[PDB]
């Protein structure tokens, strides 16, 4: 948090420690790892360090399914930082997996994550929206984007 943008060189040195901390051993370890990830993501934003940030997100993501308010807040902050760093496209891709899951709790958490992503930087989701095939009664395809010059 203190160094800011200068610490992009030391990202590689702490990746094994972050991977070890993100393992399902202690809740406090997960909270600290999420805080570290969020602070680093905010610090190194705008300088092209997505290669390690995506790998960190690959382990941070399975921590969403938690009940303790503190770890939920830490995970939400980490995912918000990863969203503002990587971009809303990857976040939308991850959150589109279970937006309509048969179960209820997973649907609720996916919907709240999607709302958090949608509140900030809404102007890029339009380009990051996927394609949905229309039904026989409603139109779900934006034909205006298929124009070719």
């Amino acid at each position: 948090e203190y160094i800011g943008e200068m610490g992009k060189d030391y990202i590689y040195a702490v990746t094994p420690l972050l991977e070890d901390a993100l393992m399902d051993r202690d809740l406090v370890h997960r909270q600290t790892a999420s805080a570290v990830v969020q602070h680093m993501s905010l610090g190194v934003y705008g300088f092209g360090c997505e290669d390690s940030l995506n790998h960190l997100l690959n382990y941070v993501w399975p921590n969403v399914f938690e009940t303790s308010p503190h770890v939920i807040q830490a995970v939400m902050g980490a995912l918000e930082g990863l969203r503002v760093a990587i971009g809303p496209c990857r976040m939308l891709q991850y959150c589109l997996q279970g937006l309509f899951h048969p179960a209820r709790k997973v649907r609720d958490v996916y919907w709240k994550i999607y709302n958090s992503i949608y509140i900030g930087s809404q102007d890029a989701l339009i380009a990051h929206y996927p394609r949905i095939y229309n039904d026989d009664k409603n139109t779900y395809i934006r034909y205006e984007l298929d124009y070719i010059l």
Binding site: G46, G48, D123, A127, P130, R131, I148
Partner: protein, 1168 residues
Amino acid sequence: MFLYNLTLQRATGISFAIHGNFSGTKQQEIVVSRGKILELLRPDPNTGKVHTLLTVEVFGVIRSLMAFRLTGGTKDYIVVGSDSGRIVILEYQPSKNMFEKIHQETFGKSGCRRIVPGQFLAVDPKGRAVMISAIEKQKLVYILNRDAAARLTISSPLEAHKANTLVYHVVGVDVGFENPMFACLEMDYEEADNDPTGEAAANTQQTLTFYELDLGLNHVVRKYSEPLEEHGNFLITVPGGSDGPSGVLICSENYITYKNFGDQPDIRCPIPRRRNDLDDPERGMIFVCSATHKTKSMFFFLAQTEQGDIFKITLETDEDMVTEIRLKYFDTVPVAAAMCVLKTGFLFVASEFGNHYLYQIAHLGDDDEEPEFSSAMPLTFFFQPRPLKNLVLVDELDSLSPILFCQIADLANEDTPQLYVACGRGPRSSLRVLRHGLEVSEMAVSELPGNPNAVWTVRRHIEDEFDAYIIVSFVNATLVLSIGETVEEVTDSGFLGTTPTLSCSLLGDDALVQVYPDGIRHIRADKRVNEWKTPGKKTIVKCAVNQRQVVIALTGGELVYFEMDPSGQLNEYTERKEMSADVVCMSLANVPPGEQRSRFLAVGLVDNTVRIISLDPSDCLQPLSMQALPAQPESLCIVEMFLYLNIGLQNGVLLRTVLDPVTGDLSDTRTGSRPVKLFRVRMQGQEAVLAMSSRSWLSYSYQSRFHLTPLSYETLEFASGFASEQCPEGIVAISTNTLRILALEKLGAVFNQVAFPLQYTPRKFVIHPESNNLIIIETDHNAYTEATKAQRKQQMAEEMVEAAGELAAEMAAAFLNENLPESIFGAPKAGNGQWASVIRVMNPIQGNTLDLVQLEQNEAAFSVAVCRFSNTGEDWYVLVGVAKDLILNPRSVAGGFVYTYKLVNNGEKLEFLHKTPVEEVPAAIAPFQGRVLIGVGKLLRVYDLGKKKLLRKCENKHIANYISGIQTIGHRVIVSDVQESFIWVRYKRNENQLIIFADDTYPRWVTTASLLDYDTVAGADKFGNICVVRLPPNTNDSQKAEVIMNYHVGETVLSLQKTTLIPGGSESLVYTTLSGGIGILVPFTSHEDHDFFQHVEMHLRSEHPPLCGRDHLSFRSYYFPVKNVIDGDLCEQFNSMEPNKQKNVSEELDRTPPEVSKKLEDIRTRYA
């Protein structure tokens, strides 16, 4: 892997316009906003010309722009609403020549959001409040007031939100010193989404909501809600108060409605239509733009229709009641996004596409011969269009905004690449050839035998407007000419000189100086000649010409100093300069306005050394500096804007040394290696320098920036100036064994172009390898071909003949005899699924065509290419993609066809061979390895030439969406999907199969792709993003590629190429956007330069924010985060800030502003 972003050409298209007194004077000025550039420009009433005065970039998207002024004031402020969630009020300072921010208030998140204000902006006519509105659910009101310090003040925003409503247009309403009033086309949709029966479209009418602004209660409340018969488009503010009645005009389909609060009856008036419309009668007519003229005697409104008809709207009203609305046809102009009516009888038209014109109103046409319409007439209306009568064209601004395809190649004899751009829309489409250099004018031709080394012009007066004596001196001959409006030889020159004239200038009022290698002469009206012979058998090389300073240079460096006393005689100083080196070139400084003699003086040598001579009597003819040079000096000159000197040597260089006794900045560029002589020229009444070489170059400085531009002409050995009443800006630049006169009419800063008119808009074109000919295909939607138009006209003629109007219907011959021009009066076309297609071959050198091919009414041309086949010989076949029955809004196509031609006789004509049906539309044509690639929907096909039709060879049904472009190189091809980024396909020739081995992970709506290497591909985006994708080195031929670069230009990009521009330079990635701008990308040659540029960009971002309060990092990271791209716009704008901050950041970077500017200009002068 780091590139530097530059901008060679700024955006030209105009999206908004406004007028007012932005300088505090009576002179009107026009403020128009580009896509992301805000610039100020004003016309000159005396000459009608338009010149730009200021141009800055806001790094944001502008959605609204208008001006206002406080009551009793004299200056108009500027309010702009950008994509950022804040509002800013601007102000123009004539002294600083820049926009000064006065206020900045934030009210929401940034970005073009649905429920964020900024789309609609309204200002009260009196100038007491401003209203900003969003698309849905949001509305804010601000109060504008002036404090006791005569400064603008901003109050708190007001809550005016209404849930589940849609707003079409917001505009202020005049009240006449009452509480400010605002009207909007608010409508609700809550019941629309709650009805499953589908009746949402029906029984849903618009409402005209009115909003007060109670200053006493400091709150806003809805006033009325009046349902409307039909949907409206936009509103008009009628000047109320003492001058006219308050009200609003509603523009709708084929109707105009007048409404006012109280007991005002509604007034309706149908929009008149042309005589014998060629369009579909079922199509409606709406309004695109409107203007006003609040004259004290009588006000009137101007409006433009879809087809460009200008209607002069006159409102007839009683003291408090409206009686009728009288429409009248004024003229016809090309469709314009915004129109402003200027004072002093001037009209400015900002056309939607193409060039922008500036008409001049001469006759108001009050009750002319053409009858006028009114709302009192019972039941439609018809009028006959006429050519331009009321307006007179004076000046127009060249524009190339709608560029669809750009290619660069060296198709001419000169060794300089030419930029070919395909721009324009509809009948106004044209092909322009952008050439780097300056404009060349040709009006006088004189072939004089001999060897004219140089020409000298001396006037009979110190500031005579016309030339008196012209010294046409040859190498081996002598002659004198004069101009007196009749070019004839002069007799009373009295020169008596046989040897070639070294120089002739204006020593006094009419004092001419003639120098010959055998002595010194003097020319004067009176009998005052200081004739002196050369000492001994020596010779004179060069002489000094100035107002009151004359120095003659002879062999051995023996300089003689001549000073002109006020008496008139010439005197020689007691001190003489002597060295062991001769003098071959030298220059002099202009006399100070107050002082009778200057001090700066530089004289060259032969030993590659230049010195400084002091003109003061204390140390006259004494050395000052010992500055060596790489080569022998050739010329020198001093350029004003505050003083700079240019040094010329034997090789081609031009050192821009700052005014100082010792050399300072060392910045020289190539001008091969021919000797360069420097001479003064004329440019907008200023002083500049000229360089002569194998190709001539000119340097000018406009607003603290130096631009080097060559001349588009053959080699020139000498040049001079020319002054005349008709053409004050004249250049006498003679050439080899001929005399040529040049002029600079337009600015011609960069990319001079020539207009080659077309018929329809161009989509794609190719270049013949050996024929060097362009094959352009054109296509328009909802268009009628020539045969269809003729058939429709004949059918209408037969119908009106059958009408049998009394037998007496003889108007058919007149109707069919005259046809309105398509470029001026527009192209009357209509339909829902109509298309057009024309195949044209044009010679690039001239404007003439070679062949024209026309297809059926329902055929659309998409792709075209020329190639050869292994089965046939060396014939160049042409394949054209043709679509059949294409419907746009609902995706449904009946089929498609592909054409084949032979192109015999070195590409001068085309012959039809056969056609092959295709199930879907052909996307693109990609020939490789003696075959072609055909893009059929989501299937990839390989076709080979046959006897009657193309033969199927391979298929690939593993592509999901529709192909939109194929590029090939080596043994692999790339497929650009409409949604997916890129698809990598390798063709196995032995197996005769297509295998996909690599693909991207981030989808993007790519438009144009341009590969840079065997595994690196660069592609654009439909939203205005540029990305570079590199294949991993460990790929095998699943595997996914990775993106290494991302950027957001801000405008849609439809061109991408990597070719060199300047000869002797380096490869650059030049791109052209849909807004008319041209930019290049420059790699970094060193790590230190990259670090310095990154530090400068970061410091400028932290210290100098953009004008509209938008985050530069967020703006560049609009859709994707920026990656390995450094913006150069901030670096170039660094030269425009006030000295304090630039110097401060200079020591903050441990550097100095001069070398910083030198480094900034080094990239521009190296890669461009």
